[PDB]
Short mmCIF file of C-alpha atoms and ligand atoms in Angstrom, two decimals:
data_model
loop_
_atom_site.label_atom_id
_atom_site.label_comp_id
_atom_site.label_asym_id
_atom_site.label_seq_id
_atom_site.Cartn_x
_atom_site.Cartn_y
_atom_site.Cartn_z
CA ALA A 1 12.60 17.05 -1.69
CA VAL A 2 10.41 15.03 0.37
CA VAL A 3 11.73 11.49 0.52
CA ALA A 4 9.19 8.67 1.07
CA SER A 5 10.05 5.11 1.72
CA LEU A 6 7.47 3.15 -0.67
CA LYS A 7 5.74 4.22 -3.82
CA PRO A 8 2.29 4.98 -2.46
CA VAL A 9 3.69 6.68 0.42
CA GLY A 10 5.30 8.83 -2.36
CA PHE A 11 1.86 9.30 -4.13
CA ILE A 12 0.52 10.91 -1.04
CA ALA A 13 3.61 13.21 -0.71
CA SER A 14 3.48 14.36 -4.30
CA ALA A 15 -0.11 15.46 -4.02
CA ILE A 16 0.79 17.80 -1.38
CA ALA A 17 4.16 18.71 -2.79
CA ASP A 18 3.28 19.40 -6.33
CA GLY A 19 4.78 22.87 -7.46
CA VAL A 20 6.61 23.26 -4.28
CA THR A 21 9.28 20.57 -4.01
CA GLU A 22 10.33 17.18 -5.64
CA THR A 23 9.32 13.81 -4.27
CA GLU A 24 11.73 10.70 -4.34
CA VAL A 25 10.86 7.20 -3.65
CA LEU A 26 13.36 4.79 -1.84
CA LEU A 27 12.15 1.41 -2.62
CA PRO A 28 12.43 0.84 -6.35
CA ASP A 29 9.71 -0.85 -8.36
CA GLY A 30 9.60 -4.57 -8.28
CA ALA A 31 11.25 -4.59 -4.66
CA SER A 32 9.52 -5.78 -1.48
CA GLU A 33 8.85 -3.72 1.38
CA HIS A 34 9.60 -6.76 3.56
CA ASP A 35 12.96 -7.76 2.13
CA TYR A 36 15.33 -4.74 1.21
CA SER A 37 18.41 -2.93 2.22
CA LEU A 38 19.11 0.95 1.37
CA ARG A 39 21.63 2.10 -1.17
CA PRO A 40 25.03 3.31 0.15
CA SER A 41 24.03 6.62 -1.55
CA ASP A 42 20.60 6.85 0.17
CA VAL A 43 22.31 8.03 3.41
CA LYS A 44 23.14 11.35 1.64
CA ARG A 45 19.53 11.32 0.17
CA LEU A 46 18.03 11.21 3.68
CA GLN A 47 20.31 13.81 5.09
CA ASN A 48 19.49 16.35 2.16
CA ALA A 49 15.63 15.67 2.29
CA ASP A 50 13.33 18.46 3.37
CA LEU A 51 11.23 15.74 4.93
CA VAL A 52 11.27 11.93 5.21
CA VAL A 53 8.01 10.10 5.13
CA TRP A 54 7.61 6.41 6.23
CA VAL A 55 5.18 4.09 7.68
CA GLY A 56 7.18 3.17 10.80
CA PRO A 57 9.63 0.42 12.29
CA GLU A 58 6.94 -2.49 11.99
CA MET A 59 6.70 -1.90 8.46
CA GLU A 60 10.20 -0.60 6.78
CA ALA A 61 12.79 -2.54 8.83
CA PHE A 62 15.20 -1.18 6.28
CA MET A 63 14.80 2.22 7.81
CA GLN A 64 15.06 2.19 11.49
CA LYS A 65 18.81 2.54 11.59
CA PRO A 66 19.12 5.26 8.98
CA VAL A 67 16.14 7.21 10.44
CA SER A 68 17.63 7.41 13.85
CA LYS A 69 20.30 9.96 12.11
CA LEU A 70 17.57 12.31 11.48
CA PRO A 71 15.56 14.62 13.97
CA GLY A 72 11.91 13.57 14.46
CA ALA A 73 11.16 17.18 13.15
CA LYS A 74 12.07 16.03 9.55
CA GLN A 75 10.14 12.77 9.67
CA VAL A 76 6.56 12.00 9.29
CA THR A 77 6.13 8.56 10.77
CA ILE A 78 2.48 7.52 9.82
CA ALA A 79 1.91 4.58 12.20
CA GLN A 80 2.98 6.90 15.16
CA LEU A 81 0.82 9.74 14.20
CA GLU A 82 -1.54 10.74 17.05
CA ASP A 83 -4.58 10.50 14.62
CA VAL A 84 -3.46 7.17 12.99
CA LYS A 85 -3.08 5.40 16.26
CA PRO A 86 -6.82 4.75 17.00
CA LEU A 87 -7.35 3.65 13.24
CA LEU A 88 -4.70 0.78 13.40
CA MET A 89 -6.26 -2.65 12.81
CA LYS A 90 -5.31 -6.17 13.76
CA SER A 91 -3.97 -8.38 12.07
CA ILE A 92 -5.95 -11.63 12.54
CA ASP A 113 0.24 -6.43 16.52
CA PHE A 114 -1.29 -4.20 13.86
CA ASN A 115 -1.30 -4.52 10.30
CA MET A 116 0.95 -1.92 8.87
CA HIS A 117 0.08 -1.46 5.20
CA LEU A 118 -1.60 1.95 6.05
CA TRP A 119 -1.37 3.50 2.54
CA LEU A 120 -4.18 1.44 1.54
CA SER A 121 -6.49 3.24 4.21
CA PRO A 122 -7.90 6.62 2.49
CA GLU A 123 -8.47 7.98 6.22
CA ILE A 124 -4.85 7.41 7.02
CA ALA A 125 -3.48 8.90 3.84
CA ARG A 126 -5.46 11.97 4.86
CA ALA A 127 -3.89 12.24 8.15
CA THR A 128 -0.51 11.54 6.49
CA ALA A 129 -1.18 14.44 4.13
CA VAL A 130 -2.09 16.74 6.77
CA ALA A 131 1.07 15.88 8.52
CA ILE A 132 3.18 16.66 5.30
CA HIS A 133 1.26 19.74 4.81
CA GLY A 134 1.79 21.02 8.23
CA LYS A 135 5.51 20.48 8.03
CA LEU A 136 6.13 21.78 4.58
CA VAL A 137 4.24 25.19 5.58
CA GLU A 138 6.82 25.50 8.40
CA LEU A 139 9.69 24.96 6.13
CA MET A 140 8.29 27.04 3.24
CA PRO A 141 5.85 29.51 4.55
CA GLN A 142 6.21 31.52 1.24
CA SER A 143 4.54 28.47 -0.40
CA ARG A 144 1.52 28.48 2.08
CA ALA A 145 -1.01 29.22 -0.55
CA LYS A 146 0.07 26.58 -3.01
CA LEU A 147 0.35 24.06 -0.08
CA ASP A 148 -3.02 24.87 1.29
CA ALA A 149 -4.63 24.59 -2.38
CA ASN A 150 -2.65 21.16 -2.73
CA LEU A 151 -4.29 19.85 0.38
CA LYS A 152 -7.78 21.02 -0.76
CA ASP A 153 -7.19 19.34 -4.22
CA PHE A 154 -5.85 16.19 -2.62
CA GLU A 155 -9.07 15.83 -0.52
CA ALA A 156 -11.50 16.64 -3.54
CA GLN A 157 -9.64 14.07 -5.65
CA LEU A 158 -9.72 11.25 -2.92
CA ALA A 159 -13.54 11.80 -2.16
CA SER A 160 -14.29 11.36 -5.87
CA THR A 161 -11.96 8.23 -5.76
CA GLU A 162 -13.74 6.95 -2.53
CA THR A 163 -17.00 7.22 -4.23
CA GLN A 164 -16.03 5.45 -7.31
CA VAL A 165 -14.24 2.77 -6.00
CA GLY A 166 -17.33 2.33 -3.54
CA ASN A 167 -19.65 2.14 -6.35
CA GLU A 168 -17.27 -0.54 -8.11
CA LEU A 169 -16.79 -2.87 -5.22
CA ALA A 170 -20.30 -2.74 -3.64
CA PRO A 171 -21.80 -5.45 -6.42
CA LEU A 172 -18.97 -7.58 -5.33
CA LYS A 173 -19.90 -7.96 -1.65
CA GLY A 174 -20.36 -11.78 -0.88
CA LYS A 175 -17.87 -13.01 -3.33
CA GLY A 176 -15.02 -14.65 -1.18
CA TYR A 177 -11.52 -14.58 -2.45
CA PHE A 178 -7.89 -15.46 -0.97
CA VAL A 179 -4.62 -13.38 -1.60
CA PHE A 180 -1.17 -14.20 -1.13
CA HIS A 181 0.07 -11.26 0.66
CA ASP A 182 -1.83 -9.66 3.63
CA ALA A 183 -1.58 -6.10 2.44
CA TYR A 184 -5.28 -5.26 1.82
CA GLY A 185 -7.03 -5.15 5.29
CA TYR A 186 -7.61 -1.40 5.45
CA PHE A 187 -8.87 -1.11 1.60
CA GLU A 188 -11.09 -4.21 2.10
CA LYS A 189 -12.76 -3.02 5.29
CA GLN A 190 -13.50 0.61 3.79
CA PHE A 191 -15.02 -0.61 0.76
CA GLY A 192 -16.96 -3.79 1.90
CA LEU A 193 -15.19 -6.45 0.22
CA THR A 194 -15.20 -10.13 1.54
CA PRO A 195 -11.55 -11.70 1.96
CA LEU A 196 -11.47 -15.15 3.05
CA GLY A 197 -7.82 -14.88 4.21
CA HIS A 198 -4.24 -15.05 3.06
CA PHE A 199 -1.96 -17.80 2.17
CA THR A 200 1.93 -17.93 2.85
CA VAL A 201 3.45 -19.07 -0.17
CA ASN A 202 7.02 -18.80 -2.01
CA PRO A 203 6.69 -16.19 -4.64
CA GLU A 204 9.74 -18.02 -6.63
CA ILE A 205 9.02 -21.91 -6.42
CA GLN A 206 5.93 -23.99 -7.33
CA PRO A 207 4.19 -25.05 -4.08
CA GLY A 208 4.65 -28.72 -3.19
CA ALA A 209 1.83 -31.25 -2.56
CA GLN A 210 1.32 -30.37 1.16
CA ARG A 211 0.88 -26.66 0.85
CA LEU A 212 -1.24 -27.25 -2.50
CA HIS A 213 -3.59 -29.64 -0.32
CA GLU A 214 -3.95 -27.22 2.39
CA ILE A 215 -4.79 -24.30 0.12
CA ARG A 216 -6.93 -25.95 -2.47
CA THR A 217 -9.07 -27.48 0.36
CA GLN A 218 -9.82 -23.75 1.54
CA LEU A 219 -10.34 -22.89 -1.75
CA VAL A 220 -13.03 -25.49 -2.26
CA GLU A 221 -14.55 -25.57 1.50
CA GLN A 222 -15.08 -21.85 1.34
CA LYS A 223 -16.29 -21.68 -2.13
CA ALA A 224 -13.79 -18.92 -3.18
CA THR A 225 -14.36 -16.93 -6.16
CA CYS A 226 -10.90 -15.60 -6.85
CA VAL A 227 -7.21 -16.07 -5.77
CA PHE A 228 -4.98 -13.06 -6.21
CA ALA A 229 -1.42 -13.16 -6.94
CA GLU A 230 0.88 -10.18 -6.89
CA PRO A 231 3.20 -8.83 -9.93
CA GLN A 232 6.21 -10.47 -8.30
CA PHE A 233 4.63 -13.88 -8.43
CA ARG A 234 5.51 -16.15 -11.50
CA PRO A 235 2.31 -17.27 -13.28
CA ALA A 236 2.78 -20.90 -12.81
CA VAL A 237 2.55 -20.50 -9.04
CA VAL A 238 -0.97 -19.02 -8.80
CA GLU A 239 -1.78 -21.50 -11.77
CA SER A 240 -0.61 -24.40 -9.92
CA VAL A 241 -2.78 -23.53 -6.93
CA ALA A 242 -5.98 -22.99 -8.95
CA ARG A 243 -5.57 -26.14 -11.21
CA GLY A 244 -8.68 -28.49 -10.93
CA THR A 245 -10.75 -25.90 -9.04
CA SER A 246 -13.25 -23.51 -10.48
CA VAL A 247 -11.47 -20.63 -8.74
CA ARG A 248 -10.51 -17.71 -10.88
CA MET A 249 -6.88 -16.23 -11.14
CA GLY A 250 -6.25 -12.49 -10.42
CA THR A 251 -3.49 -10.02 -9.69
CA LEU A 252 -3.08 -7.20 -7.11
CA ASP A 253 -0.33 -4.74 -6.80
CA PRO A 254 -0.47 -3.15 -3.38
CA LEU A 255 2.45 -0.88 -4.52
CA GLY A 256 1.31 0.56 -7.53
CA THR A 257 4.43 -0.14 -9.56
CA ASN A 258 2.56 0.72 -12.78
CA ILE A 259 1.77 4.27 -11.56
CA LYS A 260 3.73 7.43 -11.90
CA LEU A 261 4.22 9.85 -9.10
CA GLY A 262 2.26 13.10 -9.34
CA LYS A 263 -0.67 15.12 -8.19
CA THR A 264 -3.20 12.59 -9.19
CA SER A 265 -1.23 9.49 -8.51
CA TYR A 266 -2.84 8.44 -5.23
CA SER A 267 -6.53 8.62 -6.58
CA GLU A 268 -5.06 6.56 -9.80
CA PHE A 269 -3.54 3.91 -7.50
CA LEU A 270 -6.71 3.54 -5.68
CA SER A 271 -8.92 2.97 -8.87
CA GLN A 272 -6.32 0.65 -10.23
CA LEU A 273 -6.50 -1.65 -7.32
CA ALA A 274 -10.27 -1.49 -7.22
CA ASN A 275 -10.24 -2.44 -11.22
CA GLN A 276 -7.90 -5.25 -10.48
CA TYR A 277 -10.27 -6.55 -7.71
CA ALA A 278 -13.44 -6.11 -10.21
CA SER A 279 -11.58 -7.56 -13.08
CA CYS A 280 -11.54 -11.08 -11.27
CA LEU A 281 -14.59 -10.83 -9.18
CA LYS A 282 -17.25 -9.51 -11.40
CA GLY A 283 -18.82 -12.81 -12.35
CO1 CO B 1 3.38 -6.33 2.70
#
């Protein structure tokens, strides 16, 4: 099996490995990439994996130590791939939400493919086909997502999690910035004043919460203002692993944006 750190990383892995081997994801649905510790049993899961795919030490802090017990030959460490490094964005220290970049997703898929071919040369033909099928899917999706978000150019929005920079830049979306907010408690008066001022001064169209946010949080932020409330899921909790899962994840995100922004 290929073991991926986070679910969308698993979506990319499962496209290349479909019909050759299994793909498992380490981070459970609902968990945060920034606040997690691996299970006691994951140690054996990593040792048995054919391949471990992760972003890198600036993203999955929960994997630094366990990954040092693995040869670099077993790893696809996306942030440190030669073709990924020139693609890294700041951030105004790079933004490490790489699985949201169709071009880094392609570089990731090439790396996975290269390595599975070495380990399973008998499955070369299937692996080659899976890479070709992944490219075809992703290019159709890029076209669809591009068409979807183009009429939304110029509509400014804020988000509560700075995870979307690679996606936004490729598809011409107008983010205004992000806010650092507690997902669990209602914002107090100060934080509400600072946010709502920006919402009004910058004439925001939307604020986007995330699934792990209890509804009353964003509702409190939006109260009074004419700003609409949306939801984005950067980890595609909703979507099941499989051949078409990465393309599905990107389309769902574009729909989430459009569902609030169209208007
Ligand atoms: Co994040």
